[PDB]
């Protein structure tokens, strides 16, 4: 017979708006959380529970049939199940339903610190090399000097880069009561490494005050290069300010706490002749991200040393970078035949 | 007093692990690359080797022993992946990027198959509706037998206790 | 024949030629200054006193001489009259027509 | 066109240097002549310090010849620019600026 | 060119094509090669032998079956309704897909 | 020759190749020629109802068979694939009226 005449006509639109995506929006649009790095079970070749192809999150595979095959045919639309929780609807919903991964540690988005100009480092004011040192877990950066002094008593300034030895030494000289102080205490000494420091710094930022300060610095500088740098940072600051008028667009959303997962029909997994399978690289990249996140969560569960956590967090950042922009990496992820994987930006 | 890294590990000081890591990381990476070809899995196994050295730090006796431990453990981890069905299955899967312009001539479907499947579903539904319409014409006991058998499902035992007839009688009536 | 497509691409992309000839922008007397890092300095003092300094590679031939008076739009050295120099000197309609 | 529109918008307006005792105007704020006159009259009626303002300064610019590639990459539509070249850069700027 | 070329077989060639079918052991069951394949008229399986393989000398018109095959279809959990429907009507929809 | 046939499961567009019973490619230069001629309608049919408007192509086949008016085209599926990739890159793309 003829196709069912879907009366849901597409909603006409005249504009497209783009902006940074908040974690709240990613969670609100998502149907679930991908918890396993599996795609299909190797013994049954069926989508795995809570995996990248999960029928609980992304939709049924068969038309008007659930996973356990108890509810069938059009009579049972909208009934998910009592047993396998898989909605009885059209399989085409596997092209529109998305998922997410809740990262245990925030990971910076590669774009906003690799596609020049360096957006995060222009907002914070740090040069790109130091920002990379922050991101790849090599130095601590102080967000609030507090009452902490230097090793010889020198005043500690905001945005100071301290190694592990320096951080431990400074934490030693701190009073015992200061470590337990609330984050709103002006005297608390806060130093962070990785993407959490960037989150805190970009949250504490004030765009209007920063723009006025940069205009003042450009108007009262005797160096042409310093003026050029000031105006270049002013460009990005004013771009963010203009973005904040149309929608809500915050700098902290450049550091991602949730990783969205695209519908499985756009990252297929097909069976070929000879009994082999062929998968999209996006499945592999999501697998790497999930594996790193799960390993980091387990390591924190057992109170691992502070070098294993650092290595795992840096590896997780690298995995997310490979997922988004593989070519921009210094050492792009490659197959055994030395062919770089294809990411979302590729 | 500048103790050697062996006694730092024995004491329970975490910076010791930083020392052994910074010293033997590349050697263990080479050891892993000798046995496997996946850098991701090799890095995972290196992290596991160092963490398990830290966990078994109460079993070392010599400064060189530490190194030996690392190497030993890391090797066996690689070896275990020769047996894991998950790893074999995931390494038996190619990448669609290996076929140039795979989106043009591969991963295809025909809507005729979907329409035929829906038509078959409609045929089955019509047959079941015919059966449901026939049901009221039957004797009341045999109608309730079928109705129960369609909402619990050919459960001769639980139906027999529900009814009063035995397993044999209930099966015969069904 | 094939030396035409790269030229069209260079012109359409507003690319400077491989030999950008320095062109004087004001009318005045030309003088030769001190040589700086292998590049001769040409100092042009205008009728009203405006002083403009240009750098010309010594390897490139110098068309103008010392104690000479030149008008705007004249090349001080051998090369191709670059489109942006034409824009700066003769105007936007002139550069459009030249292009 | 944007340059002309901005110059026309700022034409006839004034930038406040000192807000005085006015609770509605702030230093660095651009307001129209009528609004400034009304605020000054209101302050005078209240025997408060008058607001001092200076004439807005129009920006100065020169015509520039751009290559076809750069002109295509600098279009006002980010969909058009992202489908030609440097997709990551265009999408980054579009997201940061909320185009 | 003249029609004599076609008349005298001057520029006539022979081109051979090879079509290969794999029947493997899948989880749902071992796929079989047979001339009895569901929902196809008896005319379209006239030239096939016992192993569902076209005879030597047949004319391969477009759309004819060369190597007929049945793959075990996807029986889900046998819901009671399906059990009764098969019990009364029969196994008309035997578990085999073309 | 192809009227309708197999489509892709990713892009929802006709496949490519005689063996795959695919359709011909109307590339960028063909679109440029169509724009130069000024054919909005032909370009629109080529973009939406002949390639990847999943509902639109079925409705158009039915309308040609039944003689009725042509359906109103909808959003192409490749645009939705693009939007999902952009959302997977962490960009909030919003279509507004
Ligand atoms: Zn179910």
mmCIF file with all atom_site columns, C-alpha atoms and ligand atoms in Angstrom, chain A residues 65-71 80-86 88, ligand 1:
data_model
loop_
_atom_site.group_PDB
_atom_site.id
_atom_site.type_symbol
_atom_site.label_atom_id
_atom_site.label_alt_id
_atom_site.label_comp_id
_atom_site.label_asym_id
_atom_site.label_entity_id
_atom_site.label_seq_id
_atom_site.pdbx_PDB_ins_code
_atom_site.Cartn_x
_atom_site.Cartn_y
_atom_site.Cartn_z
_atom_site.occupancy
_atom_site.B_iso_or_equiv
_atom_site.pdbx_formal_charge
_atom_site.auth_seq_id
_atom_site.auth_comp_id
_atom_site.auth_asym_id
_atom_site.auth_atom_id
_atom_site.pdbx_PDB_model_num
ATOM   1  C  CA  . UNK A 1 65 ? 8.703  -3.741 17.401 1.00 0.00 ? 65 UNK A CA  1
ATOM   2  C  CA  . UNK A 1 66 ? 10.481 -3.563 20.747 1.00 0.00 ? 66 UNK A CA  1
ATOM   3  C  CA  . UNK A 1 67 ? 13.725 -5.237 21.791 1.00 0.00 ? 67 UNK A CA  1
ATOM   4  C  CA  . UNK A 1 68 ? 12.204 -8.177 23.681 1.00 0.00 ? 68 UNK A CA  1
ATOM   5  C  CA  . UNK A 1 69 ? 9.586  -8.583 20.955 1.00 0.00 ? 69 UNK A CA  1
ATOM   6  C  CA  . UNK A 1 70 ? 6.574  -8.605 23.277 1.00 0.00 ? 70 UNK A CA  1
ATOM   7  C  CA  . UNK A 1 71 ? 4.691  -5.575 21.912 1.00 0.00 ? 71 UNK A CA  1
ATOM   8  C  CA  . UNK A 1 80 ? 7.939  1.422  25.834 1.00 0.00 ? 80 UNK A CA  1
ATOM   9  C  CA  . UNK A 1 81 ? 7.876  -1.887 27.792 1.00 0.00 ? 81 UNK A CA  1
ATOM   10 C  CA  . UNK A 1 82 ? 7.725  -3.443 31.191 1.00 0.00 ? 82 UNK A CA  1
ATOM   11 C  CA  . UNK A 1 83 ? 10.883 -5.465 30.501 1.00 0.00 ? 83 UNK A CA  1
ATOM   12 C  CA  . UNK A 1 84 ? 13.297 -3.993 27.932 1.00 0.00 ? 84 UNK A CA  1
ATOM   13 C  CA  . UNK A 1 85 ? 12.109 -0.376 28.100 1.00 0.00 ? 85 UNK A CA  1
ATOM   14 C  CA  . UNK A 1 86 ? 12.422 0.088  24.327 1.00 0.00 ? 86 UNK A CA  1
ATOM   15 C  CA  . UNK A 1 88 ? 7.540  0.794  20.114 1.00 0.00 ? 88 UNK A CA  1
HETATM 16 ZN ZN1 . LIG G 2 .  ? 10.112 -5.308 24.887 1.00 0.00 ? 1  LIG G ZN1 1
#
